[PDB]
């Protein structure tokens, strides 16, 4: 069982202590008690000097908090402090001190007739595996749920013009490129 | 009889839908998923059982 | 049968213990009792530190709670 705990302090010596409660505790006259047996920390499975730093403690057998220590809430590869990443798809997340969960991106469903428009945040890489410099706008056109990269601003999606023997589509380039059949295409151009 | 566990939810209760000889039921994968007939389906697409 | 139980605390040593209660009950003069005589959990047949985790018990025979 937990039982609870007792802070005891030395009034001789200014040295502060915990004793744990399953005992029955009887103080010297030089000794204060500075808290009522109170329950120990008791993390619930799965529940959602060394308190100078941060630490966050899962599953522990039951604990008491010790002097200097406080309740203050209810890696691979060499991360440096200030870079940003994704997590993976729906499960359960274990937090750390040196990482801050910013946000929770919901990914974009795109079906077979669009396509989801991109802007590079900051310069980066596309899933593709080029590169994108700050601004610059670019589409995906994969089927299912698009989930952007840490840089990839999402604007919206782009639904495909339907042609029919009866139309065709007025188009003019922005600037230089080659378009979906490969033709090269200079700035005002119309076809 | 369902009989219960510690790790494991009750989430909700399916009825099953019936399909009658002219008709077919119109589903969507709401995440992406395998069908019965054991092909894939990605988020959002939609197809007809029989 | 299933009778009751009772909470005995010792006053000395803090350890707190349950007594099923067919039995009579006399306590010694450190001892005190926290509850009165009531019931054992009593699962009927398909009805539909053991507790810092959870248990679901099925058709068990009569048990107190510790």
Redesign the interface.
Known sequence: ???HYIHVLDQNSNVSRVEV????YIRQDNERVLFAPMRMV?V??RHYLRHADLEIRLAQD?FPLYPGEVLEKDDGDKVVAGDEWLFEGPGTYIPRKEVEVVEIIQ?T?I?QNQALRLRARKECWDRDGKERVTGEEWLVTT???YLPAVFEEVLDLVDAVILTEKTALHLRARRNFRDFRGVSRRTGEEW
């Open positions: 069982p937990p039982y409660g399953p005992k029955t008791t619930p499975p039951p990914a469903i079906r089927v299912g749920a």
